[PDB]
Amino acid sequence: GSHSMRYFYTSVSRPGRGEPRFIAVGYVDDTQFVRFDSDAASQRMEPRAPWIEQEGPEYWDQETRNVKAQSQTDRVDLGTLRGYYNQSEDGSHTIQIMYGCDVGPDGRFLRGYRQDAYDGKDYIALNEDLRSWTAADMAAQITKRKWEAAHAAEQQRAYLEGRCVEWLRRYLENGKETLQRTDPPKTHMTHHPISDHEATLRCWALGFYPAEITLTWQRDGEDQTQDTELVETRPAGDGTFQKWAAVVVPSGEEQRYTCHVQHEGLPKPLTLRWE
C-alpha cells in the first residue's frame, strides 16, 4: 500500500522550571522509529524500532544536530508568540508541529504537508502547492510574512520532495519485514444481556496493523448508528491495534444484526453474526 513518514514536535514552556520541554517522535505509518526528549538522559535522537538501529553514527549525530536546532528555535518561537498574543510570562504555552511526506506502492512522491499550532489551535500551515502559507490569525500573518521574506516555503518543499521521500523509501526497504507486513484483525463477537428485553453485541477486532479499520453494524442489511458505540482505535503495545463496535438489540432479534470488518490485510471483508 501507500506509506507515510510523519514527525511530531511538541514544545511546552514551564516558566521558572527551566527551559521549555521538547519532545520529537517520528513515525513510518503507525510504527514509531525515532525519539527525542530534551528532559531525557541521552540528549540525542534515539531509535525506537529495530530496523533504524542499523544506521551509522553519522546518521544519529546529524539527526541530533538538526533536531536540537529545531528545539532551540522552538524555544525562541515560544517567547515571540507570547508577545504576539500579549500573554503573561507566567503562563505555560505549547507549540505543536507536524510534517511529513507520502509515497505510493510504486515509490512515487504523493504528497507533502506541514502544519503548526499554538495552544492546541491552528497557527500556520503549508498550502497544498507547497509554495504558500495560510495564517490562522493576525498573529500568524506576521509569521507568514517573515516566512515569505525568508523563502521558508521552498526550504520545506525541498525537504518534502527531497530527503523525506528518499529516506522514507530507505526506511521502507530496511524495515520491509515489519513495515510492509499486513496483520489482519482477529475477530470474534460477545453477548451480554442488558435486561429482560435488551442485549449488547460487541464486535471485536484485535492484533491488526496498520491501524486503519472500518467496523460496521447492519440490521436487515442496512447500516445502524443509533444504539451504537464505537471506541477509538487503541494500541495493544506490541505494534498491533484493537477496536470494537457495540450495539444493543431487542433480545431474540440478535440474528438480524451483522458486523462487517474491513481492513487492508483482508482482501475480502469479514462478516460476523451471532449464533
Partner: peptide
Amino acid sequence: VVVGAVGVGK
C-alpha cells in the same frame, strides 16, 4: 530524517 532550516524564526 528530520527537516532543518525552514525559516529564521516565527
